Amino acid sequence: WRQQWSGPGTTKRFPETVLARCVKYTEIHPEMRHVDCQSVWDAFKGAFISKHPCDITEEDYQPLMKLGTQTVPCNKILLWSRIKDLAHQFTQVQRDMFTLEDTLLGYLADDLTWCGEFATSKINYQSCPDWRKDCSNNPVSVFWKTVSRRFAEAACDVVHVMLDGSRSKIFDKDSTFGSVEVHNLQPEKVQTLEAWVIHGGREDSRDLCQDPTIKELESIISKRNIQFSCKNIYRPDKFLQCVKNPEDSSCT
């Protein structure tokens, strides 16, 4: 019965964008110089083409994961949930820290959508499955689920997570962070998780670290035998300014 999927189609020039980004990334990060970008693309494409976009599994991405393996300083990880723009501006200033999208694999896929068809070897630019309305095991959702697991799993010592304090659920156990990332923080490596609850402005300067969802996060982490810490960030704009110029009079 299905005629179309409910989500946007594969990004236009998805093949050129993925190949190009891999080239640009490996040039900026000399350490990844050994990466054969055409091979990366082939592995990526091989993961979903000619396959029904609702039966993708993590194994499908295994070859891409292998080729894109990258070692990231485990005490320099910044996880984030529903506040990507600030997390990315933060790492652009605090360059020694990484978000998933600062790794080769995450950079390749960020902001892109893709899927194939099981009946052909063509990329579907018309539409792609929507995680909620169509099926959860689509090419895009399985990729992020797979690479998010690996990223959190590599974290050690003090791991930080940025959260949007203006949402009804600052911490949402049903997000990728609450389902995939938090449960993959290994206590043998991770000492403590520190959440930075970002304020939006509409809300008063209340202590969002007391929020019920944050107490939920704290319990979750406590049971993982990992310490939990939470900090309010009343002024996200001033915050970035101070990361850039730490010794400025406007800083707290």
What is the three-state SS of 172-239?
Answer: CCCCHHHHHHHHHCCCCCEEEEEEEEECCCCCCCCCHHHCHHHHHHHHHHHCCCCEEEEEEECCHHHH
How many CB atoms are closer than 10 A to CB 40?
Answer: 24
Q: Is the same domain home to 10 and 90?
A: no
Please give the radius of gyration of the chain, using alpha carbons only, rounded to the nearest integer: 19
Residue 155: which residues within 8 A CB-CB, separation 6 or more?
A: 74, 77, 79, 185, 186, 189, 190
How far is the C-alpha of 95 from the C-alpha of 226, rounded, in Å? 26
What lies within 8 Å, CB to CB, of 192 at 6+ separation is 157, 158, 159, 226, 227, 228, 229
Count the domains in the chain.
2
Q: In the annotation, is 135 catalytic?
A: no
Query: What's the maximum distance between 2 C-alpha atoms anywhere in the chain?
Result: 64
Q: CA 230 to CA 219: how far, in whole Å?
A: 13
Pick the catalytic residue from 74, 115, 209, 230: 74
Whether 231 and 163 map to the same domain: the answer is yes
Same domain flag for 50 and 1: yes
CA 47 – CA 57 distance, rounded (Å): 9
Residue 182 and residue 78 in one domain: yes
Segment holding 27, helix H or strand E:
helix 14-28
Mapped onto helix, strand or coil, the DSSP state of residue 159 is: strand
User: ∠ at Cα 65 (64, 69), nearest 5°?
Assistant: 120
CA distances from 155 to 77, 222, 228, 250 (A): 6, 17, 15, 32
Method: X-ray
Give 14's Cβ-side CA count (13 Å radius): 23
Going by their DSSP bridges, the two strands 7-8 and 127-128 should be labelled as antiparallel
Residue-wise DSSP of 94-132? STT-B-GGGSHHHHHHTT----B-SSSS-B--SEE--TT
- The structure tokens 């009343």 sit at 234
Indicate whether 111 and 194 sit together in one domain: no
Which of residues 136, 154, 172 is at a domain's end? 154
Residue 134: how many other CB atoms lie within 10 Å: 18
* CATH code of the domain in which 115 resides: 1.20.82.10
| Whether 162 and 147 share a structural domain | no
Tokens at residue 183, please? 């449960």
Domain range for 91 is 72-98+155-252
- Provide the Cα torsion 87, 89, 95, 100; round to 10°: 40
Q: Same structural domain for residues 80 and 127? A: no
Cβ(65)–Cβ(146) under 8 Å? yes
Phi/psi for 196 (5° steps) reads -115, 105
**Which residues 6+ apart lie within 8 Å of 70 measured at CB?**
31, 32, 103, 104, 105
Question: Are 138 and 116 contained in the same domain?
Answer: yes
Q: What is the CATH number of the domain that holds 172?
A: 3.40.50.720
| 156 in active site | yes
Q: Reduced to 3 states, what is the DSSP secondary structure of residue 142?
A: helix
Please enumerate in sequence order all residues whose Cβ is within 8 A of that of 174, keeping only pairs 6 or more positions apart, or say none: none
> What's the reported resolution, in angstroms, to a tenth?
2.2
Q: Which of 54, 115, 135, 156 is catalytic?
A: 156
